[PDB]
UniProtKB/TrEMBL annotation:
This is Transposase. One of its GO terms (biological process) is DNA transposition. SUPFAM superfamilies: Homeodomain-like. One of its GO terms (molecular function) is DNA binding. It comes from Corynebacterium glutamicum (strain ATCC 13032 / DSM 20300 / JCM 1318 / BCRC 11384 / CCUG 27702 / LMG 3730 / NBRC 12168 / NCIMB 10025 / NRRL B-2784 / 534). InterPro entries: Homeodomain-like_sf, Transposase_8. Pfam families: HTH_Tnp_1 (PF01527).
Amino acid sequence: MPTKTYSEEFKRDAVALYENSDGASLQQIANDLGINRVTLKNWIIKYGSNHNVQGTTPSAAVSEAEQIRQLKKENALQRARTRHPAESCLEHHHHHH
């Protein structure tokens, strides 16, 4: 199985777009990129944790565990990132769990 890679840059840019929410709706951001608004919302809270959200809970490292276990275990996986991504997925992406 090839890795459907996504750089931190994408998560980073997603949250950076949220900084511009003054003129960009939550939907507009995700809709413009082509991603889910909930998946977007996840990264927003995950990286933009510092706020009037609560006291102090390390949430950034909760969802990151996916990336952690990948990089922590096998370096062989790094060569799978070299594969071309799957843009077609945005077409056949319909609600299904």
